[PDB]
Amino acid sequence: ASRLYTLVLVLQPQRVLLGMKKRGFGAGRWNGFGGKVQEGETIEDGARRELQEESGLTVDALHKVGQIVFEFVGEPELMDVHVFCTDSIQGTPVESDEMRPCWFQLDQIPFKDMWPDDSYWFPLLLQKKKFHGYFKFQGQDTILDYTLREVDTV
Numbered sequence: 001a002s003r004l005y006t007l008v009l010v011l012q013p014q015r016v017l018l019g020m021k022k023r024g025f026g027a028g029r030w031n032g033f034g035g036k037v038q039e040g041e042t043i044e045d046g047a048r049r050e051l052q053e054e055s056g057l058t059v060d061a062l063h064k065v066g067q068i069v070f071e072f073v074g075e076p077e078l079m080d081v082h083v084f085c086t087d088s089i090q091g092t093p094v095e096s097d098e099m100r101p102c103w104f105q106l107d108q109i110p111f112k113d114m115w116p117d118d119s120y121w122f123p124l125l126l127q128k129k130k131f132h133g134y135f136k137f138q139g140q141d142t143i144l145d146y147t148l149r150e151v152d153t154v
């Protein structure tokens with residue numbers, strides 16, 4: 001049994017948009033925008049919804065760039081995260097209750113203030129390669145196992 005989640009990265013030629021998570025799961029870390037996929041919406045619609053709720057942004061087209069599965073030791077549910085990317089966004093990003101948005105130069109990505117797994121798969125994102133990842137966590141800071149591979153179809 002797994003649960004569907006979304007993650008959205010706004011990636012422009014010289015900069016990537018991140019949000020500082022202000023509360024809840026992963027608070028204190030920069031991340032793409034996203035959340036639970038609801039009953040009654042597609043994964044992509046959920047990704048769009050969460051981008052809007054967390055940054056105020058809307059987008060023309062979302063592209064599937066990755067899938068990452070997470071196991072947390074002791075938790076029955078696997079987290080099945082669908083990672084999306086876009087270059088063209090609509091609007092200017094604004095702070096929400098969940099997220100404080102900020103643009104980062106591509107050589108200044110704040111990996112030490114991101115989920116540890118990002119250090120592994122974020123380069124593949126930047127290199128415009130599609131990927132499948134799996135990460136086993138003990139708590140929120142320690143990766144016990146992982147796999148990472150490029151794919152042709154996400």
Ligand SMILES: CNc1cc(N2CCN(C)CC2)nc(N)n1
Pocket residue numbers: 005006007026031032033034035036070081115116117118137
């Ligand atoms: C557990 N490792 C994670 C989780 C994570 N999450 C959890 C699920 N989504 C809401 C998006 C944010 N994002 C990254 N970059 N790494």
